[PDB]
């Protein structure tokens, strides 16, 4: 086509979605990770995770307001990944890399799994 | 912080949100523009438009499944802007620039209004 493109549009959209998340505006699901609860937008979770995409396209699960993750999932690893979904920034540290990679594999977040594998390979 | 950032994340999120829109997945509102209807995600509309942000943060309007726009709004101008919201691409043409600018002013989409004003100033 003969379209023009606004370079910063996608980043500005995501920044605004994160602002809605921070103020708990139009969040439509709670993700339960052991004793912790994380409120989010189903659409953002689906856009970032192969697991959430599969969950919310299921005709029964699409209507659930609460999703319980596998008990092996670490709440901090999930929190770091939820922040990444809404910001593009990943808080990857020596102390959390194993939990983050395990959570990203479960959530089916391929680019996160890839950088974790590379950071682990560099430290061996 | 000591975060790393995935450059393409915001663009990939928006691409996936547009894929959900195309398949009518988790769309939660109909925007009525005269005889036409446009299905969308409230969160994406709020992230792109000062008007939708104000509408869906209102305690009564946040719960509406149908929003009727002012009858002066052109359905094609709205369609072009809805596509821009989900893609960052604006189909701006000599034949539609006036309707697009008028719709972007009503929707409170400042960057779109700015490029329309510049394209109009160049042709005078």
């Amino acid at each position: 086509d003969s379209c023009i493109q606004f370079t910063r549009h996608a980043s500005d959209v995501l920044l605004n979605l994160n602002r809605l998340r921070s103020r708990d505006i139009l969040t439509d699901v709670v993700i339960v990770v052991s004793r912790e609860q994380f409120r989010a937008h189903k659409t953002v979770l689906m856009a970032c995770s192969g697991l959430f995409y599969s969950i919310f396209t299921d005709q029964l699960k699409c209507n659930l307001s609460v999703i319980n993750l596998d008990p092996e999932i670490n709440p901090e690893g999930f929190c770091i990944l939820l922040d990444f979904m809404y910001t593009s920034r990943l808080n990857l540290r020596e102390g959390n890399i194993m939990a983050v990679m395990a959570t990203a594999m479960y959530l089916q977040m391929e680019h996160v799994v890839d950088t974790c594998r590379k950071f682990i390979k560099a430290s061996e | 912080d000591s975060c790393i950032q995935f450059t393409r994340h915001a663009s990939d999120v928006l691409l996936n949100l547009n894929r959900l829109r195309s398949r009518d997945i988790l769309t939660d509102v109909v925007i009525v523009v005269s005889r036409e209807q446009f299905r969308a995600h409230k969160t994406v509309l709020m992230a792109c438009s000062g008007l939708f942000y104000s509408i869906f943060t209102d305690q009564l309007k946040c719960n509406l499944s149908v929003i009727n726009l002012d009858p002066e709004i052109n359905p094609e101008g709205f369609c072009i802007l809805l596509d821009f919201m989900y893609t960052s691409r604006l189909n701006l043409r000599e034949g539609n620039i006036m309707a697009v600018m008028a719709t972007a002013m009503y929707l409170q989409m400042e960057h779109v209004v700015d490029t329309c004003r510049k394209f109009i100033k160049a042709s005078e």
Partner: peptide, 4 residues
């Protein structure tokens, strides 16, 4: 704005 750019030509994509």
């Amino acid at each position: 704005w750019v030509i994509p």
